[PDB]
Amino acid sequence: IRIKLRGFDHKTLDASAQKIVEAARRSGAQVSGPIPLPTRVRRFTVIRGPFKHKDSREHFELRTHNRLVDIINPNRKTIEQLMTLDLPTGVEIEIKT
């Protein structure tokens, strides 16, 4: 009962890691708390100008935050409510066993 959560906005990711931990906790039974995995930053460095001016850059980055929750005690009562959840837009979920 592994559920992995990846997203770019940590504010929307923690909101989804909270609602899934809350959901499986109510309808039985044991839930392993939302653990935060180390982010993977994809940084970009680019010349500010469109022509020469080499010693002038602007740093951009792409933060791919990661979470992971575990429902220790399953019970099919949880496997139905989680199929109907309002997960935000910028968050991808992966469920494996």
């Binding site: 990846r6 997203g7 770019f8 906005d9 837009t89 910028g90 968050v91 991808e92």
Partner: protein, 206 residues
């Protein structure tokens, strides 16, 4: 030139992205290219309605677009005649579930990408720029904004020597991050060249 973009400087602090979705390394550029093709067909069509901001949501094989517009009727149509006509050509390019929504602009004169487009249209119509700019900041201030600033560069009025003419009123603290500042740019094409109109509306800090 030395000033940073007031929106890119506030992403994740005061302003949110216009494309909010997650994608993997193998799919980011593909979803991004379609994301610009949508705004390409929308900024051309929905210009006459008053386009301000194009939100795009994605989950899996589906995409939801949110168009904030001053005149929703020109986008929707007669009971939905154009709205359906848009979703048809939208999915024809998207090749997936392209759900299209419409959002009401509460105050058009408080939207920077709309203020700029009105000034760009006025000066395209042989209007006095120094006079139209003061009116633009006057309308935005009368509409409750706590600060405004309009900037137009180029061959103003047709002069050979270029000139950057501007007017501002109120408070425009471009160094404060916790201040909300809507920014928009419009392009005024004339028989003699291209003028660059910039709009700054300080709605009030958080």
């Amino acid at each position: 030139g030395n000033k940073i973009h007031p929106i890119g400087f506030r992403l994740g602090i005061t302003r949110d992205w216009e494309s909010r979705w997650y994608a993997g390394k193998k799919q980011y550029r593909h979803l991004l290219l379609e994301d610009q093709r949508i705004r390409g067909l929308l900024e051309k069509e929905l210009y006459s309605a008053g386009l301000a901001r194009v939100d795009i949501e994605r989950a899996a094989d589906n995409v939801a677009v949110t168009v904030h517009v001053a005149k929703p009727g020109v986008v929707i149509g007669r009971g939905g005649e154009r709205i359906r006509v848009l979703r048809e050509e939208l999915a024809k390019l998207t090749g997936k579930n392209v759900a299209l929504n419409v959002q009401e602009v509460q105050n058009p004169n408080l939207s920077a990408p709309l203020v700029a487009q009105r000034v760009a249209e006025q000066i395209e119509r042989r209007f006095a720029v120094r006079r139209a700019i003061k009116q633009a900041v006057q309308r935005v201030m009368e509409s409750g904004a706590k600060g405004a600033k309009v900037i137009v560069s180029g061959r103003i009025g047709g002069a050979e020597q270029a000139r950057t003419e501007w007017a501002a009123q109120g408070r425009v603290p471009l160094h404060t991050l916790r201040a909300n500042i809507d920014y928009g740019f419009a392009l005024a094409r004339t028989t003699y060249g291209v003028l660059g109109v910039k709009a700054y509306i300080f709605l009030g800090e958080v």
